[PDB]
Design a protein around this ligand. Structure first.
Ligand code: HEM
Ligand code: HEM
Ligand code: NH4
Ligand code: NH4
Ligand code: NH4
Lengths: 137, 137
């Protein structure tokens, strides 16, 4: 279930983070614009960039923290706050996050691994509603 | 489902409030001790007792609002705060709440209705989790 999925992801965090982030960018090419160093780069080119691996690691670490702190796939209001308040996120809206979770769930369903994709879909939706309540547009 | 159940309960609130609260006191006779005035009374005596009717209605009026404000059966932290901070709840621990929801879910399952009993069970558990987080012992 959801709790095991957090363990699965954490066990090989860099591999899942990179795989899912690339699925995100490739499903939604417009989102690449927020990451100027990623512009004009193939998947394998991004893997050769120190910042790519570092960044996506940090993103998925925080996502897993927020997931672990959630109750019944509903994130804490304070975690949504951390996400709204981050300077790196100042220009974002909830649609950016919504698209990320659509790509994440699609990835999980396509994978050979036994993820609880329904729970991740609920988690994404509940995060989107929480970001909005924490002041994101 | 859960949202419809809120509507069902509100549609005949006094009746459901009294019957569920009685189910609670009768399933857990020790809990009656918190309501001095209710000791040594049959169900029918209680249903003709002013404060019993007014009190149980207020409990279920607020419970339905807390349920309505929840996301995926997880209550707002502020609603949990309010319940922990009420002077009438100063002597309570999470266990009192745990027992109330066990009784409420059992009532729903035994009813002729179409309650989403497993949603109410989650709501009870999530409420208890929020009460703890808000400082109730
Ligand atoms: C639940 C989802 C998300 C989490 C947990 C998260 C977390 C993080 C973290 C921890 C960092 C700092 C990384 C570092 O300092 O190296 C970061 C940076 C950043 N995030 Fe997010 N993020 C999320 C969603 C998004 C989305 C949807 C976008 C845009 C589509 C986005 C855009 C950015 C950008 C542009 C940076 C700075 C990248 C850079 O300048 O190198 N984030 N994020
Ligand atoms: C989510 C569940 C609960 C809600 C929404 C709730 C709500 C309320 C409300 C609104 C009142 C004030 C009513 C009035 O002024 O007439 C009240 C009073 C009170 N509550 Fe609760 N309550 C809950 C659970 C409990 C539990 C589990 C107990 C103990 C086992 C409890 C013990 C009391 C007592 C002793 C009073 C004062 C009774 C009186 O007016 O004489 N409550 N509650
Ligand atoms: N695995
Ligand atoms: N699932
Ligand atoms: N249940």
């Amino acid at each position: 279930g959801f709790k095991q999925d957090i363990a699965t992801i954490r066990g090989d965090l860099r591999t899942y983070a990179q795989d899912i982030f690339l699925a995100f960018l490739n499903k939604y090419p417009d989102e690449r614009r927020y990451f100027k160093n990623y512009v004009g780069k193939s998947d394998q080119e991004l893997k050769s960039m120190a910042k790519f691996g570092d960044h996506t690691e940090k993103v998925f670490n925080l996502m897993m923290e927020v997931a672990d702190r959630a109750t019944d796939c509903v994130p804490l209001a304070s975690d949504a706050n951390t996400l709204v308040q981050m300077k790196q996120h100042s220009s974002l809206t909830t649609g950016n996050f919504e698209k990320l979770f659509v790509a994440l769930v699609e990835y999980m369903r396509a994978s050979g691994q036994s993820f609880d994709s329904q729970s991740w879909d609920r988690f994404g939706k509940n995060l989107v509603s929480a970001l909005s309540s924490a002041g994101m547009k």
